[PDB]
Amino acid sequence: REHWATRLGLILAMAGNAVGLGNFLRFPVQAAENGGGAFMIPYIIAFLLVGIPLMWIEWAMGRYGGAQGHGTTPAIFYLLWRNRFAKILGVFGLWIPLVVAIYYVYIESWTLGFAIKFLVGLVPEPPPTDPDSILRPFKEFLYSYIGVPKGDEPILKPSLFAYIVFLITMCINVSILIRGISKGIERFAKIAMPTLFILAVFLVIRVFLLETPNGTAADGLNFLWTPDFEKLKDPGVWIAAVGQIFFTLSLGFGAIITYASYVRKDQDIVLSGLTAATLNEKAEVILGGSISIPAAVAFFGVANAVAIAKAGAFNLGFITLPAIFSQTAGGTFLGFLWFFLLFFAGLTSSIAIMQPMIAFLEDELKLSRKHAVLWTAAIVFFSAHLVMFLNKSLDEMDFWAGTIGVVFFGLTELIIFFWIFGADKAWEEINRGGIIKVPRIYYYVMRYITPAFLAVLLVVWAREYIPKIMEETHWTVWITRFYIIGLFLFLTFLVFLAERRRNHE
Amino acid sequence: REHWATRLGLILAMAGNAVGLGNFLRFPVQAAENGGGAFMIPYIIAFLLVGIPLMWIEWAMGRYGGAQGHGTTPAIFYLLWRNRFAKILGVFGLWIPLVVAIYYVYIESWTLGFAIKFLVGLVPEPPPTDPDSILRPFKEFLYSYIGVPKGDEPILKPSLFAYIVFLITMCINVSILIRGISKGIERFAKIAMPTLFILAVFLVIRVFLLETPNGTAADGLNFLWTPDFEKLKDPGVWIAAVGQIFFTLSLGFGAIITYASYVRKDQDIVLSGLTAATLNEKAEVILGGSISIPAAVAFFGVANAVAIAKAGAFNLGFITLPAIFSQTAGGTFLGFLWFFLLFFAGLTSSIAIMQPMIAFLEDELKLSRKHAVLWTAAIVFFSAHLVMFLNKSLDEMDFWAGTIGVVFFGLTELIIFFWIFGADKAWEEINRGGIIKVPRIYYYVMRYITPAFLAVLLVVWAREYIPKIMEETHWTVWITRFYIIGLFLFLTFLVFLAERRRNHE
Numbered sequence A, B: 001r002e003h004w005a006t007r008l009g010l011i012l013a014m015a016g017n018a019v020g021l022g023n024f025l026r027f028p029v030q031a032a033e034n035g036g037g038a039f040m041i042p043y044i045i046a047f048l049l050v051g052i053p054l055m056w057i058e059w060a061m062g063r064y065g066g067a068q069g070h071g072t073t074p075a076i077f078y079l080l081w082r083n084r085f086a087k088i089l090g091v092f093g094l095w096i097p098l099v100v101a102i103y104y105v106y107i108e109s110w111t112l113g114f115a116i117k118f119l120v121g122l123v124p125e126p127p128p129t130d131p132d133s134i135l136r137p138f139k140e141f142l143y144s145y146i147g148v149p150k151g152d153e154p155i156l157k158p159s160l161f162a163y164i165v166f167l168i169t170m171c172i173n174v175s176i177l178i179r180g181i182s183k184g185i186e187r188f189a190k191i192a193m194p195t196l197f198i199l200a201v202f203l204v205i206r207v208f209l210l211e212t213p214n215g216t217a218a219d220g221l222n223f224l225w226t227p228d229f230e231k232l233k234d235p236g237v238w239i240a241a242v243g244q245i246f247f248t249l250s251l252g253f254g255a256i257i258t259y260a261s262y263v264r265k266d267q268d269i270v271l272s273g274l275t276a277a278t279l280n281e282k283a284e285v286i287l288g289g290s291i292s293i294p295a296a297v298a299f300f301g302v303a304n305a306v307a308i309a310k311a312g313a314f315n316l317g318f319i320t321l322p323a324i325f326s327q328t329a330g331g332t333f334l335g336f337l338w339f340f341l342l343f344f345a346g347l348t349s350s351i352a353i354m355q356p357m358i359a360f361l362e363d364e365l366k367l368s369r370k371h372a373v374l375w376t377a378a379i380v381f382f383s384a385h386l387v388m389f390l391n392k393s394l395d396e397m398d399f400w401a402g403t404i405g406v407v408f409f410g411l412t413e414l415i416i417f418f419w420i421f422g423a424d425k426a427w428e429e430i431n432r433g434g435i436i437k438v439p440r441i442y443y444y445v446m447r448y449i450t451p452a453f454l455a456v457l458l459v460v461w462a463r464e465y466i467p468k469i470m471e472e473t474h475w476t477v478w479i480t481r482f483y484i485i486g487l488f489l490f491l492t493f494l495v496f497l498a499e500r501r502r503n504h505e
C-alpha cells in the first residue's frame, strides 16, 4: 500500500481535501441567507456534535481499512459488517464522491477560466454608480461563460473557452492524481495550501479596507458574527448548518475514509483529524467568512447583500465580488487572485473526491494507478457533459449526492461502525496510536447524540422539503436522476465483479 | 462450451433470431413507402449481394470464435486481427445488440399487452364507415398505451399496464435465456417457430378473403409484387432495401455470430446458414408481405394504404390492421392472433440480441450463465426507461444502432474477416464441414462486390441524410446520444477489465 510520507503532508493533504469551494463560495452564501450570526450558533454546534465526531470515525474507518488493503466503503463496510448489504450500502461512498466530482470539477474549471480571463484583462468594464449598470456586465460575463439559457429550453451553451478550460482542469487533476498519494496529492498539498492561505489573507486585508457610502467591511463582520437567538427555532437554519458542516469537512463523501486508508496502521488519527478539521474551520469562518460578505455589505449594505446571497449560488462569488473589485484600483488583478484562490481551493478538494474511485479500482479490481486514474478521469469527464449542457443538472446532483446523500451516508457509516461493528471496538480503533485521546464524552456523543441528531434532521428533510423537489421541478430533472441512478448500478456492477475476482483465487 | 443439441434446433433458433418484428411490421412499411414492387428488385438483389454472403461470414466468424472459447466480437475480431483496435471495433457487436434490445424488447412488450387486451376484449368498438371514425379509436388506443405526448413536452406517459407488461416481457426473455442455449433458446425455438408459422398462415388466409368496395387482398399483392423500373434509379429505395436486409436477417448485430459460436467446430454452416436465411425471406415476403399491406389495400385502396405506411412505423401494425379486423366477425380474436404472432416473432428475436452481452460476460468475465443473464436483463430493463419516457429516444437508438450501425458493422466485419485475416483463410473457414460448398462466384462477391456496395451506400447515407438528423431534430435527441455513447464507453471498460483478467493468469 501507498502511504503518506510525512505527518505535515498528511495534515495538509487532508486540510486541502476539506478546504475548498465550500469555504469560499458555499459558506458565505449559506450564512448570509440564514441570518448571518443566526446561522453561526447552529453551525458551531453542528461542528461540535457532528463535524468532529464523524471526522474521527472516518479517519478510523479508513486507516482500519487501509491496513487490510482496502480504502473504499464497499470493502470497508463489509470488513466492519460481513453482510452483502454492507457492500451495497458501501457503494454510496463511491457514488457520492463520483457524482459530486462530476459538477465540482466543472465549477472548479470556471475558477480557472475566470482566473485566466481576469489576469489577461479580458473582462468587462462597467461604466465610469447605479448598482445594476455595474452588476450587469458581470452577470453577462458569467452567463456567457457557462451559457445560461436565454429562452424556454433548459439547455446550456457553454462558451468554447469554458469547455476547453474544463478539459485542462481535468488534465491538471489527472497530472496530480496519477503521481499517487505521496508524490502527487501530498507534494501538491504542501505547495497549494500555503499559497491558498497567503492569497486568502491578502484578500481579507484588502477587503477589510473597503468603505463606501453604504458601509464598511466591519459591518459585514458584525452581521455575520452577531447572534440572532430568534432563529435558533427555525429548522431550516439547522438543516442549512448541518449540510454545510458535512460539505465543508468533506464528511459523507468517502473521501476522508479513502485518504485515511493511506495512513500507516500505527500512526495517530485523533490529533491529525482534529487539526485537519480545525484548519478547515479557520479557513472557513476566518478567511471565507471575511472576504465575500464584508465586501458585499461594504458596497451594498446588509439587506442588499442578503438579497444577493439568496439570488443564486454563484452570484456572490462570480458576479458581485468581481463587480465590487472592478470599482477599486488594481481590481481586475484582485479578481484574478480571488479566482486563483478558488481554483487551488477547488483543485485540492477535487483530487480528494476522485481518489475514492481510483482506490476502489486499484484495491478491488487491481488496476494500476495509471489506468485507475485515467478511467476515473474519463468517467468524470464524460459524465460532466450532462452538467455542462442540461440546465439545473448540477443542482439535482448537488442535492442527491452532495446534500441529502452525504447526511444519509454519514448516519449510515456511523451505524455500521459504532453500532454494528461495536461502540467499544470503534472507540478503541479510533484511539489506537492516538497522540491524544478522544475526550470521553465524545463516546456518548458518537454512540447516542450524533445518530439521533442526524436521524431527526433527515426525517424533517424527507418530510418538509424533498416532496417539493419530487413535485415542483422541471421534467428534465429526470434526465439527471436517471443518469446518476445508472451510475449507481454501474458501481454496484463493479462491486460484483470485484467480489467474483476475489472468489476466483 | 455450450452447443446446440440438434441440427433442427439449431436452424430453428437461427430462424427465430431472424424471423421477428422485422418481417411483420418493418418490411411491409418499408415496401409500401418505397413503391411496393419497386422496392422488391433492390431487396432481392441486396439479399443476393449482401444478405447471403454476410450471413455466411458471420456464422463462420462465430463458429471459429466458439471453438476457441469466444462468442462475441471484441474477442473474435482480435482472434482475426491481433491489434488492440480490433478489440475496440469489436465493442460494436456488443453495443449494437444491446442498444437495439433496449427498444425492441419494449416494442415486443407492446405486442404482448395488445395480445392480452384483444383476447379479453378490452379494446375499442368503432361505431356501427367513415374511415376516421374507425381508425381513431385505435390510434387513441395505441396512443394511451404508450403515452404519446398530448402537449409541447417530448415526454411519454406509458400506461401502468404497458409498464407492467414490459416487466413481464423482460421476465419471459430471462426465463428462456437463463436456461441456456440448448435447454432454453433451442427448446423454445422448436415450439415458437411452428406456432409462428401456423398463426401467420392462418392470418394470410383470413386476409386473402377480405373484399370491400375499395379493393381485394389480390390488389395488395399486385401492388407489392409488380415491378416499377422507374425507382431502380432512386438511391433512397436501395438504402431502404439494404437496411431492411440487414435488419431482417439480423446481420451486423453480433447476434448471428454469437449463436454460431455454439455450433460445434466440425458442423456445417453453409447449408444451415442458407436455410435460416431462406426461412427468413419466406416468412418475410410470403407471410409478412401477405398480411398487412393486402389488408390495408383491400379496405382503403393503394393510395391510402401507402399514405398510412408513411404515417408512422406502427400505424399499419398497431392501428390500421386491428381497425380493419374490427370490421370483421371474430375481429378482436384475429387481432389477438396477430399480436400473439408479433409477440412470439419478437421474443425469438430479442433473446438473440441479448445473448451477445450474456456470452461476453460468460466467455470474457467468467460470470455464470445465471449472473450473466440477470445483469444483462437489468441493464436492458434499466436503459429501457429512456425509450419508455422520452419521446423519440426509440427512433434515435434505431437509427444509430439499428440502421447505420449495422451497415457500418457489416462492412467492418467483412473487412476484418475477408481482407485482414485473409480472403483465402476466410473462404476455407466458411467452407470447412460444409454439407454443400459456397458457390465459387460468392468468393468474388465477398471479397470485392459486397464491401464496395456497402461502402458506397454508407457514403451516400453520411452525405444525403445524416446531416439532417444532426441538424433537423429536437434537442432531446442529445439525451439519447449521450446515454448510448455512455453505454459504448461502459462496454469498452468491460473489454478492458476482461483483458486485465486474462493477463492476471
Ligand SMILES: CCCCCCCCO[C@@H]1O[C@H](CO)[C@@H](O)[C@H](O)[C@H]1O
Pocket: A157, A158, A159, A160, A163, A385
Ligand atoms: C468527446 C466527448 C463527446 C461528447 C459530445 C460533446 C461535444 C462538445 O461540443 C463542443 O461544445 C462547446 C461548448 O458549448 C462548443 O462551443 C464547441 O464548438 C463544441 O464543438
Ligand SMILES: CCCCCCCCO[C@@H]1O[C@H](CO)[C@@H](O)[C@H](O)[C@H]1O
Pocket: A116, A160, A161, A164
Ligand atoms: C490556456 C487557455 C486556453 C485558451 C483557449 C482558446 C479559446 C478560443 O476561443 C475561441 O477563439 C477565439 C480566439 O481568438 C475567440 O475570439 C472565439 O470567440 C472563441 O470561440
Ligand SMILES: CCCCCCCCO[C@@H]1O[C@H](CO)[C@@H](O)[C@H](O)[C@H]1O
Pocket: A157, A385, A386, A389, A390, B470, B478, B479, B482
Ligand atoms: C447530456 C449531455 C449531452 C451534451 C452533448 C451536446 C453536444 C454539443 O452540441 C452540438 O454542438 C454545438 C454546441 O452546443 C451545438 O450548437 C450543435 O448544434 C450540436 O450538434
Ligand SMILES: CCCCCCCCO[C@@H]1O[C@H](CO)[C@@H](O)[C@H](O)[C@H]1O
Pocket: A048, A438, A439, A440, A441, A442, A445
Ligand atoms: C458539548 C460537546 C463537546 C465536547 C467538548 C469536550 C471538551 C473536552 O472536555 C474535557 O475532556 C477531558 C478528556 O476526557 C476531561 O478529562 C476533562 O474533564 C474535560 O474538560
Ligand SMILES: CCCCCCCCO[C@@H]1O[C@H](CO)[C@@H](O)[C@H](O)[C@H]1O
Pocket: A469, A470, A471, A472, A473, A474, A475, A476, A477, A478, A479, A482, B155, B156, B386, B389, B390, B479
Ligand atoms: C428522460 C425521461 C424524462 C421524462 C420523465 C418525466 C416524468 C414526468 O414527471 C415529472 O416529474 C418532475 C420531477 O419529479 C415533476 O416536478 C413534474 O411534476 C413532472 O412533470
Ligand SMILES: CCCCCCCCO[C@@H]1O[C@H](CO)[C@@H](O)[C@H](O)[C@H]1O
Pocket: B157, B158, B159, B160, B163, B385
Ligand atoms: C425500478 C427502476 C426505477 C426507475 C424509475 C421508473 C419509475 C416508473 O414509474 C411508473 O411508471 C408507470 C408508467 O408511466 C406509471 O403509470 C406508474 O404509476 C409509475 O409508478
Ligand SMILES: CCCCCCCCO[C@@H]1O[C@H](CO)[C@@H](O)[C@H](O)[C@H]1O
Pocket: B116, B160, B161, B164
Ligand atoms: C398479466 C396482465 C397484468 C395485468 C396488470 C394490471 C394492470 C392494472 O391497471 C391499472 O389498474 C386498474 C384495473 O382495475 C385500471 O382500471 C387502472 O386504470 C390501471 O391504472
Ligand SMILES: CCCCCCCCO[C@@H]1O[C@H](CO)[C@@H](O)[C@H](O)[C@H]1O
Pocket: A470, A478, A479, A482, B157, B385, B386, B389, B390
Ligand atoms: C430517462 C428516463 C427517466 C424515466 C423516469 C420517470 C419516472 C416516472 O415519473 C414519475 O412517475 C409518474 C409516471 O410518469 C409521474 O407522473 C410522476 O410525477 C413522476 O414522479
Ligand SMILES: CCCCCCCCO[C@@H]1O[C@H](CO)[C@@H](O)[C@H](O)[C@H]1O
Pocket: B048, B438, B439, B440, B441, B442, B445
Ligand atoms: C449474381 C450473384 C448471385 C450468385 C448466384 C450463384 C448461383 C450458383 O451458381 C452455380 O454455382 C455452382 C457452384 O459453384 C457452379 O458450378 C454452377 O456453374 C453455377 O450455376
Ligand SMILES: CCCCCCCCO[C@@H]1O[C@H](CO)[C@@H](O)[C@H](O)[C@H]1O
Pocket: A155, A156, A386, A389, A390, A479, B469, B470, B471, B472, B473, B474, B475, B476, B477, B478, B479, B482
Ligand atoms: C442533455 C443535454 C442536451 C442538450 C444539448 C443540445 C445542444 C443543442 O444542439 C441541438 O442539436 C440537435 C440535434 O443534433 C439539433 O437538431 C438542434 O439544431 C440543436 O438545438
Ligand SMILES: *SCC1=CC(C)(C)N(O)C1(C)C
Pocket: A167, A170, A171, A172, A174, A374, A377, A378, A381
Ligand atoms: S489530460 C485528461 C484527459 C484527456 C482525455 C483523453 C480527453 N480524457 O478522457 C482525460 C479526462 C483522461
Ligand SMILES: *SCC1=CC(C)(C)N(O)C1(C)C
Pocket: B167, B170, B171, B172, B174, B374, B377, B378, B381
Ligand atoms: S423477471 C426479470 C427482472 C426482474 C427485475 C429484478 C426487476 N430485473 O432487474 C429483471 C429484469 C432481471
Ligand SMILES: CC(C)C[C@H](N)C(=O)O
Pocket: A017, A018, A019, A020, A021, A022, A023, A100, A247, A248, A249, A250, A253, A255, A349, A350, A352, A353
Ligand atoms: C466535496 C468536498 C471535497 C468539498 C470540500 N470539503 C469543500 O468544502 O469545497
Ligand SMILES: CC(C)C[C@H](N)C(=O)O
Pocket: B017, B018, B019, B020, B021, B022, B023, B100, B247, B248, B249, B250, B253, B255, B349, B350, B352, B353
Ligand atoms: C435485431 C434483429 C434480431 C431483428 C430480427 N431480424 C427481426 O427481423 O425483427
Ligand SMILES: [Cl-]
Pocket: A144, A145, A159, A161, A162
Ligand atoms: Cl468565455
Ligand SMILES: [Cl-]
Pocket: B144, B145, B159, B161, B162
Ligand atoms: Cl393500457
